[PDB]
């Protein structure tokens, strides 16, 4: 398989970033791409063996380094918000046949005082829907966060679930007229009415937020908007 | 460069699918199709170097190459909800065989069929600190469009299909809410909605 | 009745050194383009006067091709070193011969794609340009992996493709 690191990263303009790419099967060709809106994805860099490089379609801003056959690095010396993107690394033992990595979401900020942690809430199933449809619908809601760099997950009984969940593909601008406006994200977990009726069941929506690192500058009135896990929680209800 | 006509495509479940792709190289390049399922990396769907113009791919996917039209069209006899992803067409020029170039990608949304539609609008109260309300539109059909918020202060999400694997039941859903003093159920979700929903 | 050939070979170095790679090109039994690795300036050189006219972009491109071939051959000699369970205290060699035969009509008669290792026939492409002929134990692996990766059609894409056009392009300059 192909493993890239880190999965998620938030930095400031001028900051130093380095993306790692390791393969376990010793393929030779290795790639560094970025996927953007309306541009699909574009080739940043690529290498045809250890100790070698090759320029892609968009090399500006990004330098690379191939130390070994299985280790490919994409370096980012001068950070700019135009480089806020999703980076994929690839491998190939065949021209055109690529093995893509997990993904690396990166957001570059010109400013830190616009960084806000999400406020998460759980809304309990309406009794009308319970009586009418024999079903219960919980709604997780994360509001007022910036940048748009979160990961929502549903945890029933302390265990993550993927059944009966619709999380919005991409959050909403609170102020769509603004450009660096905060974001809001919703999600719905739907279960059987008898499952929510059970008071012994534990439901919880968790938002993994990526913000300021430990090595970030911070002197302000508000609480430091670090990368954190903001959660909300509700128990089952007979009623 | 690779040109894919549409970035957004919507098709009912259990229907034929053709995603088009045209390249700009005179000398016939190596042709490829790739899939990107949400929150995943890209996987090679299929390839073509030379020979048989009709290339069979995994998961019932095919691709016809047309030297005449410089085309490389992806086709599938029938689509399912699991086939909801972003599809990319990729090429590599002769000599630069290991140098790929991807298209903009076509986001394929497959509207699933629902045997028993019963649209409704409910009000959900917050777990802690009551009187925090959220209006929910659900169990409607994939044919009715969910409109954006006309007021910036009120927030409406686009539709979303969830799947209860156990009951074999999928449902669309949109969520609306507002922190203002005056906001109700029939007050929101107004645009292009059925008068047959439960309140 | 014209032809074209490419002989690319790699030889492992004794002790602890980087292997030697070479690439010689033939057009109608005539050397026209050449490359070596241990040379002072490892690049492609024309061996006949007719070639010299070609632009610099051609040369830099085929040079990058040559480098990619160096890495390719390296990975492959390590691979075959692993296949035949050989220790690193020896010297081995790998050869790739790829070419094309064109009849009087100008259209391709016979494509050629042959890989040999240690003076022994390793794997060879067939006249149908679709199947593979392998002899020993380690070669069948390559045949399987290339049957699944569809190698024959890629090498066919080169053979029926660029080989012919470039061959004629060279013949026109003579």
């Amino acid at each position: 398989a192909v493993t890239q690191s880190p999965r998620n990263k938030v930095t400031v303009t001028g900051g130093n970033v380095t993306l790692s790419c390791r393969q376990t099967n010793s393929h030779n060709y290795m790639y560094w791409y970025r996927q953007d809106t309306g541009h699909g994805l574009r080739l940043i860099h690529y290498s045809y063996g250890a100790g070698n490089l090759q320029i892609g379609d968009v090399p500006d801003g990004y330098k690379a380094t191939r130390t070994t056959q299985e280790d490919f690095f994409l370096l980012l010396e001068l950070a700019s918000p135009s480089q806020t993107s999703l980076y994929f690394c690839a491998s190939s033992d065949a021209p055109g046949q690529l093995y893509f990595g997990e993904g690396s979401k990166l957001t570059v900020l010109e400013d830190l005082k616009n960084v806000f942690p999400p406020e998460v809430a759980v809304f309990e199933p309406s009794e009308a829907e319970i009586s009418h449809t024999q079903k219960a619908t919980l709604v997780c809601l994360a509001t007022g966060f910036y940048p748009d760099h979160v990961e929502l997950s549903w945890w029933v009984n302390g265990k993550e679930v993927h059944s009966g969940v619709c999380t919005d593909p991409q959050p909403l601008k609170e102020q769509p007229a603004l450009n660096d406006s905060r974001y809001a994200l919703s999600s719905r977990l739907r279960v059987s009415a008898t499952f929510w009726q059970n008071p012994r069941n534990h439901f919880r929506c968790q938002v993994q937020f990526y913000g300021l690192s430990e090595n970030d500058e911070w002197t302000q009135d508000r609480a430091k908007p670090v990368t954190q896990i903001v959660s909300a929680e509700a128990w089952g209800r007979a009623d | 460069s690779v040109t894919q006509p549409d970035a957004r495509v919507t098709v009912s479940e259990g229907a034929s699918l053709q995603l088009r792709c045209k390249y700009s190289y005179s000398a016939t390049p190596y042709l490829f199709w790739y899939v990107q399922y949400p929150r995943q990396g890209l996987q090679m769907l299929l390839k073509y170097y030379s020979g048989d113009p009709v290339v069979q791919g995994v998961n019932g996917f095919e691709a016809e190459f047309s030297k005449s039209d410089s085309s490389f069209h992806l086709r599938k006899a029938s689509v399912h909800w699991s086939d909801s992803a972003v599809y990319f067409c990729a090429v590599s020029a002769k000599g630069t065989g290991s140098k790929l170039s991807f298209g903009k990608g076509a986001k394929l949304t497959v509207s699933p069929n629902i045997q028993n539609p019963d649209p409704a609008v409910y009000q959900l109260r917050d777990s802690k600190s009551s009187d925090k309300s959220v209006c929910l539109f659900t169990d409607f059909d994939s044919q009715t469009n969910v409109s954006q918020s006309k007021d910036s202060d009120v927030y409406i999400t686009d539709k979303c299909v969830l799947d209860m694997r156990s009951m074999d039941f999928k449902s669309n859903s949109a969520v609306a809410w507002s922190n203002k003093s005056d906001f109700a159920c029939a007050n929101a979700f107004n645009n292009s909605i059925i008068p047959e929903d439960t309140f | 009745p014209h032809s074209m050939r490419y002989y690319e070979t790699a030889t492992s170095r004794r002790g602890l050194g980087e292997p030697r790679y070479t690439s010689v090109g033939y057009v109608d039994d005539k050397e026209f383009v050449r490359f070596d690795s241990d040379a002072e300036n490892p690049r492609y050189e024309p061996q006949v006067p007719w070639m010299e006219q070609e632009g610099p972009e051609y040369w830099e491109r085929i040079t990058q091709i040559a480098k990619g071939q160096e890495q390719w051959f390296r990975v492959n000699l390590r691979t075959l070193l692993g296949y035949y369970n050989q220790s690193a205290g020896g010297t081995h060699t790998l050869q790739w011969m790829y070419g094309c035969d064109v009849g009087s009509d100008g259209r391709l008669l016979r494509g050629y794609e042959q890989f040999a290792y240690d003076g022994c026939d390793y794997i060879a492409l067939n006249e149908d340009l679709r199947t593979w002929t392998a002899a020993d134990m380690a070669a069948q692996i390559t045949r399987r992996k290339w049957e699944q990766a569809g190698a024959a059609e890629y090498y066919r894409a080169y053979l029926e493709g660029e080989c012919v056009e470039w061959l004629h392009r060279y013949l026109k300059n003579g």
Binding site: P95 | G97 | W72, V75, Y158, C163
Partner: peptide
């Protein structure tokens, strides 16, 4: 035109 090996083995 020289060819690219492309495939490992």
């Amino acid at each position: 035109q020289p060819a690219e090996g492309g495939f490992q083995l």
